[PDB]
Symmetry: D2
Subunit: 114 residues, 4 copies
């Protein structure tokens, strides 16, 4: 029910081998590790979770943008990109979190479908 897609606005390409960490907000308001992986050759990270595990709650998707730019020999602005959202059962069932990266900027959108 959760996919992450990362694109590179400098090169016009998928952002490949980017580390992505997902956290779930715990009852004590700390962030607990939930899922992680590296984006593929297509800039996508599939298979993070299952419908059973992905219960309603607040989630954070952290994208390791700084390492990505450093590997390309570029000095970037941000430490990482964060996307924080609530998963809601009455909304559509599948969430795609997309991020478009530049050295000093990023944009993100959610595509939520059934």
């Amino acid at each position: 029910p959760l996919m992450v897609k990362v694109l590179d606005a400098v090169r016009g390409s998928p952002a490949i081998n980017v580390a992505v960490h997902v956290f779930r907000k715990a009852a004590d308001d700390t962030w607990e590790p939930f899922a992680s992986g590296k984006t593929s050759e297509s800039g996508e990270l599939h298979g993070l979770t299952t419908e059973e595990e992905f219960v309603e709650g607040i989630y954070k998707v952290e994208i390791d943008t700084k390492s990505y730019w450093k590997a390309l020999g570029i000095s970037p602005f941000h430490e990482h990109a964060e996307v924080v959202f609530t998963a809601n059962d009455s909304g559509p069932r599948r969430y795609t979190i997309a991020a478009l990266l530049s050295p000093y900027s990023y944009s993100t959108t959610a595509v939520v479908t059934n």
Copy 2:
């Protein structure tokens, strides 16, 4: 070799049934019709052209954003969104033109791969 993808930043969804027109710049500097279609349920328009037909040149992708917003009962700012670019044979072979739409803003990116 050309795909167009359109997303809605207000609803968090693909932008469905959006008209898209592609033009090729002629030798007299006018824009000639090249390809057109309506985005699908996934917000994508596939099958616009073939490798044989998609020669080097300057192309314009016009997305009929105004009709899209009007159909949702929303008054938008732009008449349409335009994306104008050169197709180059020495670059990668497949072009995805992506647009993210809001009533008073849009963003676009190109993902060019082999």
Copy 3:
């Protein structure tokens, strides 16, 4: 009543010396030249027009992004960024067209105010 602001997402800076051409749709449906200029050291272009001259119409703001990236020695994707809009159709407004540039992507937004 018309201002254009351009930022560079690679440098984290204003996009300076960007050429901007504005056109207005004529009665015969062609694009007539309306005004032009270049962004300053602040990435802003002021003074394109006056409230008298900026009548109702369909306007196109063409931002010459390829010339900007090539002047910097960089090969970008787009030829330019075009913003096309109806202006002043419920009376005079003030328009700021802002653009954020990367080599293979741009974002644009409008801020419309009623003086």
Copy 4:
């Protein structure tokens, strides 16, 4: 040396009365409150800090987008927009953090200048 600017992509207007909280990473790796405020009628928030107080560090600018869209009666996707960056590590700079908001999307950029 720190300014935050927020625009609304639905209205084509400044995003007014948006709460912004800034944090700074402490020695113990926790986020310490640093400053806070609300955007004005222009969508800008000035006066968060001083050049003396804005020392080298890792800073987080949290823009309370959900409170903004809910204050407007709208149900948005994100809880907030977070911008996290190292500041002043090659000496004092001036930072503008700009954000463009939609219910299911946002864009942010930084303009970094050397006074």
